[PDB]
Every structure is written in C-alpha cells, then in structure tokens.
Design a protein around this ligand. Structure first.
Ligand SMILES: Nc1ncnc2c1ncn2[C@@H]1O[C@H](COP(=O)(O)OP(=O)(O)OP(O)(O)=S)[C@@H](O)[C@H]1O
Ligand SMILES: Nc1ncnc2c1ncn2[C@@H]1O[C@H](COP(=O)(O)OP(=O)(O)OP(O)(O)=S)[C@@H](O)[C@H]1O
Ligand SMILES: Nc1ncnc2c1ncn2[C@@H]1O[C@H](COP(=O)(O)OP(=O)(O)OP(O)(O)=S)[C@@H](O)[C@H]1O
Ligand SMILES: Nc1ncnc2c1ncn2[C@@H]1O[C@H](COP(=O)(O)OP(=O)(O)OP(O)(O)=S)[C@@H](O)[C@H]1O
Ligand SMILES: [Mg+2]
Ligand SMILES: [Mg+2]
Ligand SMILES: [Mg+2]
Ligand SMILES: [Mg+2]
Lengths: 758, 116, 189, 337, 232
C-alpha cells in the first residue's frame, strides 16, 4: 500500500478511447445504457478531462454500436486531450450553457502559405453558420474550406471554461497567424509519463504535496499538521528539475519557481526583494507551491560564506520560512545535489524536515528511461533495449539521453557519402532512410564515459543459491539467522530472545564467502551494500570522520538490508601490522565501526556480515556479545563440493558428454573454488585458440583457390569436447599450502579465546 | 549551541544563570505522547506505554512526527474509498478514521530519530 | 582499548601513561569532595594499565572479579531464564556441573541457543499444519491449539554440545597472579 | 568513418585550377561538354567559390583545348579566391544579373607613388568603357594604363553579391588610396590549412558545430538535440585560439568573441553588461557562435574566489547559459588550459 | 614534464629470445580486441591484468612496448618514482588522473613499472611498522576494481623484488596472469647480441656464439654494456 495513491480507480464514468470512423470533429460514441446511466440526454454537452489539465467539450450522440467500456473519437480530440490510444478519460455532464459575445480564431501560417486567398468567406463561413459547435479556449480544429489542412486556434474569448458558439457570435479574422514551432514546442510539456524509474518516490511526493492541498479537511479532521518543506536530493543528472516541472504541469495549484543562480546573480538588495516578492505572491494567491531550485547556491554553510550579503540572504530565507502558518496553504520544496553543504539551520523542525532521496536507477529503471527517450527515434528491428539496459552500469538519466543522441549521430555518419555539408538541403529519401541499428548502440555504448561509477550501489543482487556449490549447512544456518526475524517477529516475543545482528565468516582465500552474503540477500529480497577495506582506507584521509557515519546512515535509510563488510585484513595489516608493531590490535577505522555498531536500534532490520582471511591480527574488540557474534569458519571444499563447484562454473559454456568431473575433482586436493574456476577458464581459452586457428586455415584455403570458393562449410567447433581439461590440469598450481591449512584449523577451533591476554 | 556564544556574555551580571532543558526519559515520553494525541481518535488497541518504552532516542518533535506518520498510515489503509480526483469526501469516511496499534508500529518502524 | 591503542601490546615507543588517561587523571584530581560524584572503572587487561591511575586520591579500591563458582553458575542460569517459560523437566545443577571455565556470557549463549532451537521447531510445526490443511482444504476442521508453549528439555543437551570455552587455564592463572599483586606495579616494571 | 566529414566529395561541377595563357583578367577555360553539361551558354557569368568565403565572378568562354577535369585562370583570380595551384573550386551558374548604380574603386598608394599624373582619364577610361566587366565587392584588379602595375580596389558598391558594370555606371576617383600593409595583413587570415597535427579533433569539431547549424532539419528529423557547450582544453601553446579563428573565418555563421581578461579588467557592473550584450547580440542575429577564450579567468572555483563581484560574474554566466533554448540556434564554445 | 600517450616504435624485432611469452601475450591482448564474439560463443570473460617479475635486466619493458606496437594501441607508462613524487602535494588526484586519461585514450596498455620503490618506501626491506599493503598501491587497487569491461584498457605490471609485493594486488579480477621472466639462455644470448648490434657496422671476423658461451649469468643489460664498450 506504499504506492496505493498511484492507482487509477476505475469508475462507471471512465471511458477508454478507440478509433472513430466519423470525420466530423464534434462526435463521441456512447452506448444507450451509458446515456441512460449518467442521464445524458441526446444533444448534451459533456465536459471531457484528459491529461496535463487539458479539457474538451463535444455534443453527445447515441452511437449504439459502441461498447459500454470504451468511447470513440478522432485525432483532433485526442490531440486536444493529450492522450494516446488506450488511455482513460473522465466524462462529466456539464449542461451549464451560456453563449459567447466575441470569439477570436487565429490560423497557423505554414498551412496558410502556399495560397491564402480570402480567409473569412472561404474558410470561416460554412463551418460556423448554423452549427452551434462548442469550443474551449485553446482548441485546434480543422476546416476543409481551402486547399488542404488549414487549422485554426481560438485564443481570445470571454467565456473561459467553454461556450456553444451561436451564429450571432462575432467572428474575426484580422489577427496574426501562429507558427508551427509555437505549437510543437508546447506539445513537449512534461507529465507523469515522462518520468521513468522513480515510482516509489512519486508515491511519496503525491502523498506529501498533492493530498494536503486538495483535501485540507482530512488533515484537519484526523488531527495532523501537514509538512511545510520537502527536500529532494540525489546525484547530478537524476531528474529533480524534471519532477519539478511535472508537478508544475499537473498539480492544479499556483506554481512559482526560484532559481539559485538567478537570485544570486543580481545586485545587493535586489535579491532579497525577489525572495520577498516570491513569498508574497504565493501567500496572496491560491494554494501554492514554491520550488527553490539549487538551494545550495543561495544557502551554504556559514563557514564557507565570506560575504555580508550572502549571510543576509540566508537569514532572509530563514525568516521567510518561519512566517508560513497553517492558515496559509503554502508548500515549499527545494532541490539540491549537495545535501551536506546546506546550512544546518535549514534542516531543522518546521523548515525542511522531510527528505526524499531520488537515487541512481537499477536495470528495470534504465529500461524505462530508454523506452521514454526513444519514442520519437525510428529504431530498426534489430534493436533490443533490454541488452542495452543490462550493459549500462553506472549511468543516470542524462547519460542515457546522451547515449541515444550519440547512437543517432553514428547512424548519420554511416550515411555521409550522400549528405553534403556544402549544399542547401538534403534529399527526402535520405531523411527517410535513417534508422538506428544495434551496431550504433554498440558504438555509442563503447564510447560513453558515465558519471556515477564512483558511487555506492544499493540494489537487490542477482546471485541465487544455485551459483554456489557446497556449503549447505551454512545455508541452513544463514536462513535461520536472517530470514526468521523478518518473517516471524512474534515468535521471538513468545520466548524472551532478542535476535542477534552479526555474523563473521573467516577462513582460507578463495573459499566462497562473498557469494553467500549476496545469496542470502537475494533470498530475503533485501538491499545489499558492499564495503571493502581498500575503499575505506581511501577517502578517509581527506574526510576523517564522515565516511563511516555516511555508510551506516545510508544502510539505515535503505532498510531492510545486509551490510557486508569485506577484506578486513587490509585495515588490520595497514594499522595492526604483520608481526605486530607500535600500532594496536584495535584500529582507528575498526574503532569507529564498533562505535557505529553499538548505537544501532533493533527496530531496524539492518544485518551486518563480515569477512576476513587473516584471523590472527583481527581486533579482539570486534568480537563481543552485541556485535559480530556468530563465528562461522568456512573451510576448503570436499570432493563432492568440488564436483558441485565445477558444475556451477560450467553452466554458461556448452561442453560435451565425454568429460568426467568426478575424476577431475579427485585430481585436485587443496584447490579452492578460484582454482577450479581458473581451470575452466583455461579450457575455454584453449578452445577459442583452436577456433581462431581453424578459421585462419579455412580463409587461407579459400585464398589458395579463389576461382571456385565452393565449400560452404558449417561450424567446425560448437563445444568443448575433452582433453583441454588435461592440459589445464597440467597448468594448475595449488593456492594454499598445508602448513597454512593446519594453521587455519588451529584458528578454527579456538578464536574466541583471543579476547583476554595474547 | 551553548559553547558557540561569545564568552563575554556568560559572565557575572549578564547571563549567569543557566537552565538545562534535556532529552526526556520514558516517563517524559509518555506525557508528551498523551499531550499530542488528545485530538486524535485512538482505537482501544493503542497502549501508549509500549510506544513510550520503544522510542529510545526521540525528543519532543520526533514524537510529534511519530503521531503524524501514524495517522497518515491510517489514511493510506482507507484509500480505496478516498478519491484524489473528486471534490469532497463522504462524512462516514471522515468518521471511520481511528488509529490502531498497527499504525504506531509502522510509524515506529520508519522513524529515524535525532538524539541517538 | 586506550591502553592498547596508546600503550601497546608488548610495549612500544608509547608510554604506560596515555594521553587520554592523562587528561582523565588531571580531571579527577581537581574534583571537590562536596560533590557526590563517584567514579568506577573496568578493564580486562590489567597488565598494560597505567601505573599513574592507581595512587591514593584516585581509583583506590581494587576489586578483582573472578570466574563464577558452580552455585554462582546456578544463580546466573536462574537469572537469564526469567523472561522465557521453561518446563519442570530441566535440571540447572547438572547443567552448571558440566561447565567449568564458562563465564556468564557463555551461559547466556547456551540459553539463547536453546530458545533459537525451540523457535525452529515451532515454525516447522506450523508449516506442517498449513501444508496438511492445504492437502485436504475441503474440510479444514482441525481447530488446533498451540503445539509448543515452553522449552521442555533436550534443547539444552544440543546447546551443551555446541558450547566452547571462552578463557583458557593459562589465562586464568595469569589473572590470579595479577589478582594477588597489581598494586606493586607503581615502581619499576 | 571517424574523419568522414573531412572528405571533399568530388562532383561534376568541381574544377581544379591550372595556368592560363590569357593576360585578360576575366577569362576562364572550359571545355565544350562542360558548358553543354551545366547548360552554360557562351557569355554566362558563373559564381566561383574558393576558400575562406572569398568568391569571384567571370564571364565564361569556350576554350576547347582545356580538359574536362580542370580550369585555367591567371594570378588575379587565384589571389581573389585564395587558392594555390592544385586546389578545387566550385562553380555555380548564377545569371541573376542586375546593373549597378554607383561603383567606387580605390587605388593602392605605393604603386601610385613614383608618378601619379591623372588617375581617371589615363587609368579608368580604357578598361571600363564598353567592356561590361563584372566585379565583386572587394576585388583587386590590374589596369596597365600607367607606368607599371597599379592595382585598384572596389570598396563601396550598392549591389553587394556582384554586378556587371555598364558604361553608364558612375565611376569615381576622389577617394583615399590604400596601403600595401592593409592588404598584406589581410592575406594572413587563418583557414583549415594553417592547422597541423589535429585532424582527428577537427573532425569532431565539424561534427559538433558546423553540422547542427547548416542543417537543423536532420537533427529535428532523427530526433536529436544538438549540444550547447563545447570545451576545448590542452596544455599551453597547443593551438586553441588558432582553431577558434579558423572556425571564425570559415563557418558562415555570426561569430562573437569574448576574452577573459578583457571582461575581468573592467569596473564592477560594466562586465556583467558586456556578458549580457554578447548573448543578446548573438540571439538577435543569425545562427551564431560565441567563443569564450580563457574561461578559467572569469569562472574559477568558489573556494578560490574571494570577491563578491567575481561570484556575481560566475552566477551571471550560469544564468545566461541556461537561457539558451532549442529555438535559438546558438552554440557556445570555450577554451581553457 | 607531461605524460606521453603515443603508439610506440619498438617492434618484436628489437627483442631477442622470449618467444613463448610472445605467443602468450598475443593471446591475452590481441584476441579480445580482434575477435569479440568468440568470447561470447563460450561463457568466458577475458582477463585484464598481467604481471611480469624476475631478475633485473631481463627485458620486461620492451615486451610491453612491443605488444602495443603489435595491436596499434596507445601506451601510457608510469614509474613508482614518478608516483611517489607529486603525491605529497596532491594526495588524492594523481592516480585518478592517470586512470581517467587511460580510459579516455582507449584502447591502450597501461604499463605500471618499478613497483619495488613503492613497496620498499612504504612496505620496507625486512618489514617494518608499515604494511604489506601500501597507500599508493591501495588507491591503485581501488581504481582497478571500478573499471568497466566494455573498455579495452589493459594493465601490465613489473617488479624485480617479488617478496615485498602486496598480497592484495594478486586476486582474481586484478593482475592475474603471473609470468616469471628468467635469465636468458645461450641461444637467447646470441639473439640479444644480434639485436643490439644492428645500428653499428661490424666485420665478418667476429663470432657471437663463443661470446655468448663465455657469459653465464649475464643479462641483456650486460651484453649491451659489452657492445657499448666495444664501440667506445
Ligand atoms: N528519471 C528520468 N526519466 C526520464 N528522463 C530523465 C530522468 N532522469 C533524467 N532524465 C533526463 O535527464 C535530463 C536532465 O535531467 P535534469 O532534471 O536536468 O537533472 P537534474 O535533476 O536537474 O540534476 P541537476 O543537479 O540539476 S544537474 C532531463 O532533461 C531528462 O531528459
Ligand atoms: N562454492 C562456490 N561456488 C561457486 N563459485 C565459487 C565457490 N567458491 C568460490 N567460488 C569462486 O571463487 C571466486 C572468488 O569468490 P570469492 O568468494 O569472492 O572469494 P573470496 O572468498 O572473497 O576470497 P578472495 O580473497 O576474494 S580470492 C569466484 O570466481 C567464485 O565463482
Ligand atoms: N597545430 C598548430 N598548427 C600550426 N601552428 C600552431 C599549432 N599550434 C600552435 N601553433 C602556433 O602557435 C602559436 C600560438 O598558439 P596559440 O593558439 O596562441 O596557443 P593557445 O592555444 O592560445 O594556448 P594558450 O593557452 O592560449 S597560451 C600560433 O600563433 C601558431 O603560430
Ligand atoms: N631480450 C632483449 N633483447 C634486447 N635487448 C634486451 C633484451 N633484454 C634486455 N635488453 C636490454 O636491457 C636493457 C634494459 O631493458 P629493460 O627491460 O628496461 O630492463 P628491465 O627489465 O626494466 O630491468 P631494469 O630494472 O630496468 S635494469 C636495455 O638496454 C635493453 O636493450
Ligand atoms: Mg536541475
Ligand atoms: Mg571477495
Ligand atoms: Mg589562447
Ligand atoms: Mg625498465
């Protein structure tokens, strides 16, 4: 029910569009129980409501071959209501008919050019005289009283909602025509169908902004004060100004826009006047919205601010924010991409207390952004957008827009021997022979350098249990540690047990510790944040305290998630040392990690998992009840575990029936999963070598007798047969010696005793 | 920020007395919740002492935001009748609003407090 | 943690006096006795402790807290088990006579292991009931009661099997040797 | 195909220059299938296009000993079209002939010094009377009506593309002569033949700047919005202002130049007015280009900036950059090191 | 004092000996550029790293230049001396700038070199209070993880002190293919002496086989020293 406000709520007065066969531009098709249902008598004028607050009126007819669930109209009404084929449109019986005094049509000039002639007695006469045809202020209608399609536009009219034009209503033709660009730019407005990948955040913004302005009575009745400030934030390029313009074109409230650089670019004493005039016009008018775009340009921290005028602008904004009262019905919302450079006095209670995090999209989001941007391009049949959406990894929305643009420019460059820069114009067949193929998207995807590669990925992973071979007892244990406090809360309340929060995995290298932590997150459908000690020794020396607080705050915000620390030996060996040194067994980064792990409330479902392969120099202070508790040693795999691993790696490549995996696991003794993956990768590389060498022999043989060229061969190798595994078996070297294996056994039995002395 | 004030103001004869308003304990949180929910219509299920025990790092404004988020959850459960498209809401729908303990568990699951 | 991040494990170039513990000693000297502020410390590494902490007018009354005895272990197991309901088949005296070097944290680990086993059996039993109701949904006439309200016995036996000791005996005799004579660490060594 | 826009695309109307033996300064050499090919009747006036937007017009003759792939002209036309020996020149049949009202030649003084005598009845009489010789506004032609080579320059003329001068067109000689330095400095303009070592980058700049201004219809048809900002960068001395002046002399768009130190050297409140006037003149005029040279002098990081006026100039530039719309046809490009 | 990003001029012909590693380096570098789809028939993703290690003077730099000349790729060369300088002034930007420049100029081989200076200025000779992991090599590992496979940037390393090397460098998904480059054999020494002697004219009285049979533990640098002594 978190996105329940985005449901369309189908009702008996909902009418789905369909194609109509009447060329008349004032027809609807309704069935007889529909007209007897809404008491629509024949000849009524209904009020049709579409998208982006566009409306229309038409006189109703009883087309009884229509269905009870649909309606049929032409392209004129469907461009006056901004709908596609298969979109709902509300109907409202509004017979409040008053006549107009003067109407004022205006033509569009590009269809008028060619031949004009006389506009009035040839164009406006036979369509208006004794027709009573209704119009809304701002309609584009078509009259076939000329050479071809010459359209008209009703601009100035004294009845503002709509009117039935009597023949006595004064019709003029003296005005100025309109350009084609003036309408085609206004057809590129933004609604909720131009935003992809942000469904969960649009739900929250409609709960916060649209609902307390349409229905104040509910919030006054149940006893709730609605918020006054919403702060959108995210990385650059993720569509915050787009969501702004979308609410600006829907909401049906007064909208006022403030830019950051436009305020700060003006002379001193003129910028404060623009802030005051903004809030006075918003409180003077209706239920309103004020959007302050780029807030961190007009209100930074006062350690960075050096002027007097800039501190005066920050204090002016605080004073104006505090003047908003419950009577006023004004929502202020702001957008930034540096959410920690805003002055902290603005983020307190009563000012900007709500925060909505627009984030980097995942694969399902990238597919929707690509399908929005390529709706005007002409794609070839080769183009598969799901492959492109899988291959774009660190992209945000503006990067996908630049990807589509670079692809179409590559499609132009392939058509360059016909197009001349020297000439005046291009042949229409050349402008018709443009279609973007998958080779263009592979070029454009090869060239693009994205922006959000150095961000932390918070997604649900794709590793299932099936990718892991062996380790089944720890699967049964990790299910019991993670999944049941989420799924069965009350069964921990029957007894008096509070569940634990930590798991540590330790063991030899290559044994398979990362894949389990991803697989449990895939099992529980939780988010997954991954941290590495290399990544935490970097970007600490510049920001000495903020980094580990930011990680835990982001994990608390995205709950439920497993927060996977990894590679703890780099922290332990850069600070704690190899044979010991002047540094401690406690390490500064691991110290601040322990501090953050103590102050974590159990109402959250954040679960912490660790991993190290050097269990001797580990901090003793990590291991204590209420922290990483459940020590699990992950050993070298057994021979049936090795058969399961080799079945796991070999699923992508096709192999033959001559291969035996049991003997191949009985050859390896101390070999990990990384070593078995090395063997499989060696075998695939040998097969590719034989394939390329065979193709070279075929091409040289065709070069030898090019007079015939009549072989027409098939594929000489589709699979790995055998005996590449024998050469790969010859190459293999062991990764962990046996002295190390008995040392890991001695740490496997007794590591918990390391807390005291030694 | 009592340590960013100019130290000349905190001397004798100027601002010498100091009263420390602090973070409340459990007995205080119960009284703040009983003040804020005196206009809401609670169901009979709601036990405010359990809520006052489970809120640990909250201050007064956090308890106000907790009550507000609970009542908005009670609205969202009643969404198939309430229409954003219409003009007004049925009076029985405005009378069938009562906040239950499931709402306070949702709101308490979602809240990130300030004084942890 | 202060003593081992500044004073070191086997000793190092840092002192036995530590900067944070230095400023703590300075703050503890200038404290008037008209106030009723009472200071209590705790450490489990008594060898790398600063000698300057221990002097009259500072942390004086050294108290060594040892491993618990078997009646102390019975009292600990009575203490942890008050929130959860257990049955009358359980014997705590034998269960404390099994543990030798086990602390209070280890006995709490045993009780927590037993509660987790009981929750596993409860969820598996509910899954069998729901699958049986799925098997014959035409009647659905069992109207069962609660299959498990308490811990009966024998979860403690599997928990006894899982348990591992926390402190070795070499460490226990080292703590005895620091237990008798720690006050002599002020002078040399 | 990465440098495919730099191909010359040879066509049937392409004419390679060669040496001509006629001392007359209005001759071309075309073959008979060339004149029957482009429907060039004998005595037509074609529109010749060279390099750096210089043009020329000459009356056509049927020199049948010429080859079908070349053309022959003297040094006068090859200095009026800025080409070397072995460069292509487009031809266009443009018979749109209208006569001129007043023409205005001007001599060059260093050849006039020595002896001048009378300029009009000795120099301008026997070359213009009953000749119908065409001129473009800005031609340098030679008349042997004196001691030696004394050249003339047509500056003020009411027909701007070209005109065939009738003998009734009023010829003046009262004006001021021109110096040798005034032409020899203007022969040192910059084209694409003064840039070496940057072929791969000139391909990208012609794809980004020249193509969305000559043909907006393609980008509107295939559904592409063209970029608004291009940032050239490099080490000092690598030829960024040179590529700037090269596009300023080719592109056939309105060009406006902004320097960094020239903006920042002015008094407070006069520099913002120069930025606003630059973008208003560029949006007022044609398809345009704005080149902001040394961008890092007028917009550094705001950790380095200490003034209020310098932060106001950075915010002014951001506001003006956001005002550019798809309707406007303005490309902004900047250079920094 | 700029970094040179060019296609090199060293061919295969300048190198004597080491023919098995020529056949291996062709298979590691050239085929994922030339034959993309043959890695899509099977399920193999190609690797990105190679490490060369061995004794000094054995000829490790010339191979890395020669493969770049073979594939017609750019070639960025980095030295640990060059990276311990201009880090103390700019503590975070330097190694990000190198990898961004290598990503911009793709396809290129990015050749790290002289890793012992980082390992011996931070990791130490007999060990010290510093780690086996080093700050510069830490940020190198961070930059090497976040590198997309759609790019064709290939990374090659070299060290002649393989004991104090960081263990964290060697892991799958990083510098994988360890290749030990040994001292040359006597036919390899004849090939080296044929390689150095191409610029200067020599007579027909000289025997190179006996001259390689005199040298036992002598590297390529020593044989080049002998030729240079003769020219002097
Ligand atoms: N979710 C999205 N769906 C569709 N288009 C998107 C989306 N996100 C970004 N875009 C495109 O990206 C373009 C730029 O997005 P912007 O709204 O300008 O980003 P932004 O949120 O303003 O970030 P900054 O901080 O202002 S640079 C838009 O014009 C869209 O074309
Ligand atoms: N049980 C397993 N099933 C499948 N693949 C495995 C298994 N164990 C290890 N691997 C492979 O081992 C490689 C490394 O896996 P990881 O778990 O990341 O290794 P690790 O335990 O993190 O140790 P390091 O330090 O990363 S080498 C991958 O190629 C895995 O596919
Ligand atoms: N690629 C080139 N081809 C020909 N001449 C060049 C080239 N690059 C530089 N030059 C010469 O170098 C001179 C100076 O170049 P500039 O264009 O002034 O360099 P710059 O790009 O302006 O660098 P800065 O940052 O402004 S100092 C030019 O006048 C040319 O004479
Ligand atoms: N196989 C070879 N063929 C030709 N010259 C070689 C060969 N091996 C080494 N050399 C010479 O050895 C010298 C140094 O080459 P490098 O590969 O740079 O040495 P290195 O392996 O980097 O070890 P250092 O530390 O630089 S001495 C040059 O003079 C090369 O010409
Ligand atoms: Mg924006
Ligand atoms: Mg791992
Ligand atoms: Mg310059
Ligand atoms: Mg070298």
């Amino acid at each position: 029910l978190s996105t329940a406000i985005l449901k369309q709520k189908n009702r008996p007065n909902r009418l789905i569009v369909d194609e109509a066969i009447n060329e008349d531009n004032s027809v609807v098709s309704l069935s007889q129980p529909k007209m007897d249902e809404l008491q629509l008598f024949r000849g009524d004028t209904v009020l049709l409501k579409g998208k982006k607050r566009r409306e229309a009126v038409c006189i109703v007819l009883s087309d009884d071959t229509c269905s009870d669930e649909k309606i049929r109209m032409n392209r004129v009404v469907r461009n006056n209501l901004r709908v596609r084929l298969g979109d709902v449109i509300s109907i409202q019986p509004c017979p409040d008919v008053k006549y107009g005094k003067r109407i004022h049509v205006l033509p569009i000039d590009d269809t008028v050019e060619g031949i004009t002639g006389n506009l009035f007695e040839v164009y406006l006469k036979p369509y208006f005289l004794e027709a009573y045809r209704p119009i809304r202020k701002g309609d584009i209608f078509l009259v076939r009283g000329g050479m071809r399609a010459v359209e008209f536009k009703v601009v100035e009219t004294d009845p503002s909602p709509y009117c039935i034009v009597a023949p006595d209503t004064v019709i003029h033709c003296e005005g100025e025509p309109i350009k084609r660009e003036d309408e085609e730019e206004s057809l590129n407005e933004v609604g909720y169908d131009d935003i992809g990948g942000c469904r969960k955040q649009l739900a929250q913004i409609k709960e916060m902004v649209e609902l307390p302005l349409r229905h104040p009575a509910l919030f006054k009745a149940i006893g709730v004060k609605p918020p006054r400030g919403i702060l959108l934030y995210g990385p650059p390029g993720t569509g915050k100004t787009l969501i702004a313009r979308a609410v600006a074109n829907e909401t049906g409230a007064f909208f006022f826009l403030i830019n950051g650089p436009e305020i700060m670019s003006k002379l001193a004493g003129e910028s404060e006047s623009n802030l005051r005039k903004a809030f006075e016009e918003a409180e003077k008018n209706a239920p309103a919205i004020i959007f302050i775009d780029e807030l961190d340009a007009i209100a930074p921290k006062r350690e960075k601010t050096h002027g007097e005028v800039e501190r005066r602008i920050v204090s002016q904004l605080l004073t104006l924010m505090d003047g908003l009262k419950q009577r006023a019905h004004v929502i202020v919302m702001a957008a930034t991409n540096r959410p920690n450079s805003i002055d902290p006095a603005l983020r307190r209670f009563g000012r900007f207390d709500r925060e909505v995090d627009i984030g980097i999209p995942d694969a399902t989001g990238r597919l929707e952004i690509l399908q929005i941007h390529t709706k005007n391009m002409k794609l070839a049949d080769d183009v598969d957008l799901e492959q492109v959406a899988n291959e774009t990894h660190g992209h945000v929305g503006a990067d996908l827009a630049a990807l589509c643009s670079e692809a179409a420019l590559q499609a132009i460059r392939k058509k360059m021997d016909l197009i001349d820069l020297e000439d005046e114009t291009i042949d229409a067949e050349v402008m018709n022979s443009l279609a973007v193929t998958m080779d263009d998207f592979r070029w454009a995807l090869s060239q693009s350098n994205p922006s959000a590669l150095r961000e932390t990925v918070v997604e649900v992973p794709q590793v299932t249990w099936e990718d892991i071979g062996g380790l089944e007892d720890v699967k049964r244990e990790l299910q019991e540690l993670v999944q049941y406090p989420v799924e069965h809360p009350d069964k921990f309340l029957k007894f008096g047990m509070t569940p634990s929060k930590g798991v540590l995995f330790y063991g030899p290298p290559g044994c398979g510790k990362t894949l389990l932590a991803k697989a449990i997150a895939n099992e529980c459908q939780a988010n997954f944040i991954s941290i590495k000690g290399p990544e935490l020794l970097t970007m600490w020396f510049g920001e000495s305290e903020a980094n580990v607080r930011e990680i835990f705050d982001k994990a608390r915000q995205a709950a439920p998630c497993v927060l996977f620390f990894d590679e703890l030996d780099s922290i332990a060996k850069a600070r704690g040392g190899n044979i010991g040194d002047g540094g401690g067994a406690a390490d500064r980064v691991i110290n601040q990690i322990l501090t953050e792990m103590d102050g974590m409330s159990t109402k959250k479902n954040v679960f912490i998992i660790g991993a190290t392969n050097r269990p001797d120099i580990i901090d003793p202070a990590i291991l204590r009840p209420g922290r990483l508790d459940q020590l699990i040693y992950i050993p070298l795999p057994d021979e049936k575990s090795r058969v399961a691993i080799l079945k796991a790696n070999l699923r992508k490549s096709p192999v033959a029936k001559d291969v035996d995996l049991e003997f191949l696991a009985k050859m390896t003794n101390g070999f990990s999963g990384a070593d078995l993956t090395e063997i499989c990768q060696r075998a695939c590389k040998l097969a590719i070598r034989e394939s390329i060498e065979s193709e070279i022999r075929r091409e040289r043989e065709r070069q030898t007798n090019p007079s015939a060229m009549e072989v027409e061969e098939d594929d000489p190798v589709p699979e790995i047969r055998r005996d590449h595994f024998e050469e790969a078996m010859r190459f293999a070297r062991r990764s962990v010696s046996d002295n190390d294996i008995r040392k890991y056994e001695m740490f496997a039995q007794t590591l918990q005793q390391s807390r005291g002395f030694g």
